[PDB]
Amino acid sequence: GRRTLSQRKGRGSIFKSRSHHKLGVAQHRAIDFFERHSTVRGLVKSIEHDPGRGAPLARVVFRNPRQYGLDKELFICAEGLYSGQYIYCGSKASLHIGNVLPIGQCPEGTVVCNVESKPGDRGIIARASGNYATVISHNADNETTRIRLPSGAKKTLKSNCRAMVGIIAGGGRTEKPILKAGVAYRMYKAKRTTWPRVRGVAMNPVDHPHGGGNHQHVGHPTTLKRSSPPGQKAGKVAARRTGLIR
Amino acid sequence: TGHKGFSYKLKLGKKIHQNRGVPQWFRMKTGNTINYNFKRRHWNRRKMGM
């Protein structure tokens, strides 16, 4: 048959990201001595709206500690930040909302966000709206600490991985029911080309494996092995279970 | 168009220059068969495609 819609998605055609009005890459600043063995102070100049993402972005401004000028950064807002607030980033920073601390200095039970999976990689985990990761325990024997990811999974990271103390702003975004197809159309203004999704059973046998006959149905089980080739991998993949959960 | 490049305009002028018939004196030469220019065209008949 044809190449299904999932195959056509990996080619980088019209399915490219609609990132033209985006503000930029949101991350911590690059690690240095003044962050490893001191604290640098940042000023939250403004809080802006980055298209395509649900959380506001803070236009933080630091001072260059080795040369003359400014280090205009772009952080992800923690809930409660306000314009003109001072935020301190470093190993000796105080445990306040918005401060950037290595994950080893946070007491067990601290709620953090924008955590680095690897030291110095400028933020990976807990970046969506209203999300956060909790610190579970420390292990000074091998300099590793345990955190609980927003998916519930537990992850062990190095004790010098940085994080922002608090909650990502914009929580409760997905609790408001979209009511109209027009509203969902505007949701993907700064996203990829995915929205109007035709059911595979409404397709033809050439287009999709579900492309059916005289009655709209599937015909074969929709739970498939992980090793299925691209093209026939349509439906539920490696499904340990199905049906409504109890 | 009203707007054209310099090289394109010169190729327009040459197509104008080549749209002429045989001069009468050339038609009086001995053993002459060239009476009409069969490469001729007119704006409303054939488009020169350039």
Binding site: - | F6, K9, L10, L12, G13, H17
Partner: protein, 60 residues
């Protein structure tokens, strides 16, 4: 009004007219014709009369 080579600009034509006819030129406008030639409108200085240059050249 003259006809000049296309590869000549307005500055060359002004100097060429002054050298060829020993006059003064204050303004030159050029348009390139379809065939390829460059029509040049050379306006002489007020104290120079173009009627005498025409008969000297041979236009009349």
């Amino acid at each position: 009004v003259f006809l000049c080579e296309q590869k000549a600009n307005k500055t060359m034509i002004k100097k060429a007219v002054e050298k060829r006819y020993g006059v003064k030129v204050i303004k030159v406008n050029t348009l390139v014709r379809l065939d390829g030639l460059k029509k040049a409108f050379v306006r002489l200085a007020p104290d120079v009369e173009a009627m005498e240059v025409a008969t000297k050249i041979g236009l009349f």
